[PDB]
Design a binder for this molecule. Structure first.
Ligand SMILES: Nc1ncnc2c1ncn2[C@@H]1O[C@H](COP(=O)(O)O)[C@@H](O)[C@H]1O
Ligand SMILES: Nc1ncnc2c1ncn2[C@@H]1O[C@H](COP(=O)(O)O)[C@@H](O)[C@H]1O
Ligand SMILES: [Cl-]
Ligand SMILES: [Cl-]
Ligand SMILES: [Cl-]
Ligand SMILES: [Cl-]
Ligand SMILES: [Cl-]
Ligand SMILES: [Cl-]
Ligand SMILES: [Cl-]
Ligand SMILES: [K+]
Ligand SMILES: [K+]
Ligand SMILES: [K+]
Ligand SMILES: [K+]
Ligand code: NA
Length: 177
């Protein structure tokens, strides 16, 4: 299924390319032909056309293809440089997290923790669902993106809904949901 193959694509492109003999470039790109070869080690019926269809149909915009190169746009667990188009349109964004982080966030802002980018979403439901990944005490922070930009932070379009930024200062958090 698309769900099973996309799950393997995401694992290879974000977390363990070397396991499949792929070496991502500094921006996380690998040869799409080599990704087909890697994926067919699990799912031999997969084709390059299929992988391209998965990219086109992915509801989050998880994947990006440029020429012969394919990458995950966000979510890597290894170091990657992500030079995505700037989001200049959003005025409000959302950050889903858990209540236990509020004390630290309220003093320090939203900080990069292991990855070098803070993850935001244009969609409140998406942020809520993403916060649920860290537990049941979910809170969603409303972020004044215009304020973020005015402070000189560039917000990049990493998916259809995901947005990335270096840091969210406390005074850009307008509310807690
Ligand atoms: N079910 C999940 N629970 C927790 N973290 C996840 C889950 N799925 C993916 N992740 C992590 O969150 C990132 C984004 O997932 P997604 O936005 O669904 O592509 C992944 O690259 C992983 O780092
Ligand atoms: N200052 C902070 N104190 C505590 N937790 C934070 C802080 N800044 C960010 N976080 C959390 O760190 C986590 C990073 O998740 P991810 O960006 O998916 O790796 C999210 O749950 C954030 O809400
Ligand atoms: Cl690996
Ligand atoms: Cl693309
Ligand atoms: Cl990321
Ligand atoms: Cl990049
Ligand atoms: Cl680039
Ligand atoms: Cl979020
Ligand atoms: Cl997550
Ligand atoms: K995609
Ligand atoms: K990648
Ligand atoms: K506090
Ligand atoms: K984050
Ligand atoms: Na997370």
């Amino acid at each position: 299924s698309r769900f099973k193959v996309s799950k393997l694509m995401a694992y290879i492109l974000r977390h363990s390319p070397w396991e499949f003999g792929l070496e991502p470039d500094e921006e996380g790109f690998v040869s799409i032909e080599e990704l087909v070869n890697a994926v067919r080690k699990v799912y031999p019926w997969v084709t390059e056309e299929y992988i391209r269809e998965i990219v086109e149909r992915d509801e989050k915009g998880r994947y990006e293809i440029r020429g012969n190169k394919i990458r995950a746009r966000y979510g890597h667990s290894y170091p990657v440089i992500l030079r995505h188009e700037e989001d200049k349109e959003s005025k409000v964004l959302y950050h889903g997290t858990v209540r236990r982080n509020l004390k630290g966030i309220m003093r320090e802002g939203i900080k990069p923790m292991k990855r070098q980018y803070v993850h935001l979403s244009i969609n409140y439901e998406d942020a809520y669902n993403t916060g649920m990944r860290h537990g049941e005490d979910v809170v969603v922070l409303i972020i004044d993106a215009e304020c973020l930009r005015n402070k000189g932070y560039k917000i990049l379009k990493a998916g259809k809904k995901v947005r990335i930024v270096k840091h969210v200062p406390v005074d850009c958090i307008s509310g807690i949901l």
